[PDB]
């Protein structure tokens, strides 16, 4: 029941990334170093490449949590600029006021 | 010159609330809470 299919894709990507994060961290730690032999590092590169594509954290997009807008999202509130303005201008966000100085 | 350390008073997690509630009587003008 998400806002759009893009939000559904983002949710699936986040879930898969959470599932595979421990293994990705372990393999990356095996890779991002110079102590270990090169052959083992190449094997680790192949193994992390063999992981599902959607498990990569870089594919996660910080869409708005109410309109799926992929840009203008304030990370502190996870809302698009339009929705954040709509809520703040109605006084429904604590402590947020028009800035005049 | 010697310093003494007082004993630690201990109480239940609701002791402060009960102590405060002991100071309020029933509001005559008010219907039950």
């Amino acid at each position: 029941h998400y806002v759009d299919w893009r939000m559904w894709r983002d949710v699936k990507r986040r879930k898969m990334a959470y599932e595979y994060a421990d293994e990705r961290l372990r393999i990356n730690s095996l890779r991002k170093n110079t102590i270990l032999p090169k052959i083992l590092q190449d094997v680790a590169d192949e193994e992390i490449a063999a992981l599902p594509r959607d498990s990569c954290p870089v594919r996660i997009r910080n869409r708005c949590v109410m309109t799926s807008r992929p840009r203008g999202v304030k990370r502190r509130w996870r809302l698009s600029r339009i929705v954040f303005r709509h809520l703040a201008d109605h006084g429904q966000l604590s402590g947020i006021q028009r800035a005049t100085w | 010159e010697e310093v003494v350390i007082p004993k630690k008073k201990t109480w239940d997690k609701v002791a402060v609330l009960q102590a405060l509630a002991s100071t309020v009587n029933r509001d005559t003008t008010a219907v039950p809470y």
Partner: protein, 138 residues
């Protein structure tokens, strides 16, 4: 005439463990409202005075975080709306109070903390040297 004839009281048990000594409690309350912070300061100061606790008050400088958003839903980049979130502070320093008194006062002032006001209490716990440090094991 309907006053209770007898009063029930909570149980305060004097344990055998020595109480913790606090040099300073730095209750820093943050809020969006100066009047609310002033009322809370008055309440806390009155409570401390009536509980026999030394207390000092000061006001750290406020922090006004500001940010900017595009106004129109489409284009019109030159037009923006600027919002801010003022954070006003009030630091209460309570000196030389035991652990029991500190716990009671903190519970009293925290249960009555107004909505929209956060609290960060810093406790300075006086301690004695462990036995391993009083004299060298060597």
């Amino acid at each position: 005439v309907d006053v209770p004839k007898d009063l029930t009281k909570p149980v305060v048990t004097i344990s055998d463990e020595p109480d913790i000594l606090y040099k300073r409690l730095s209750v820093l309350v943050k809020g969006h409202d100066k009047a609310v912070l002033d009322s809370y300061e008055y309440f806390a100061v009155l409570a401390a005075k009536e509980l026999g606790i030394s207390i000092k008050v000061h006001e750290p400088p406020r922090k006004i975080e500001r940010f900017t958003l595009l106004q129109s839903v489409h284009i019109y980049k030159k037009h923006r709306v600027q919002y801010e979130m003022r954070t006003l502070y009030r630091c209460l320093e309570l000196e030389h109070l035991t652990g029991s008194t500190a716990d009671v006062y903190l519970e009293y002032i925290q249960r009555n903390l107004p909505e929209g006001v956060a609290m960060e209490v810093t406790k300075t716990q006086l301690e004695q040297l462990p036995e391993h440090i009083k004299e060298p094991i060597w």
